Amino acid sequence: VDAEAVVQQKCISCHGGDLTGASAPAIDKAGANYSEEEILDIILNGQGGMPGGIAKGAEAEAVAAWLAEKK
Numbered sequence: 319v320d321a322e323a324v325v326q327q328k329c330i331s332c333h334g335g336d337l338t339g340a341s342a343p344a345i346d347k348a349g350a351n352y353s354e355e356e357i358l359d360i361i362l363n364g365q366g367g368m369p370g371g372i373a374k375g376a377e378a379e380a381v382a383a384w385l386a387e388k389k
């Protein structure tokens with residue numbers, strides 16, 4: 319995946335360039351809060367205001383897993 323590139327044009331759109339939370343809660347430390355399995359699910363199936371399947375395909379995987387490393 320280019321996980322970061324995706325995030326840098328998908329998640330940051332609400333989570334902020336910095337992932338520190340802007341229009342949405344900070345996922346900077348999502349990988350610590352929740353496992354790739356959970357984060358991936360959230361990306362795929364959104365959550366509250368977050369529309370599910372913002373990323374799809376290996377995109378979402380790479381993002382989630384890259385985030386699993388980002389703590």
Ligand code: HEC
Nearest residue numbers: 328329331332342343345348357360365366367368372373
């Ligand atoms: C704005 C339309 C969003 C985009 C684009 C992405 N996310 Fe998001 N996310 C958003 C909100 C409003 C919320 C909270 C939803 C609620 O009201 O309950 C979230 C939540 C997450 C979470 C879980 C955090 C938590 O609720 O405890 C994760 C792990 C997450 N989001 C990841 C994520 C990624 C990686 C995205 C890019 C593919 C992404 N989000 C986009 C709003 C928005």
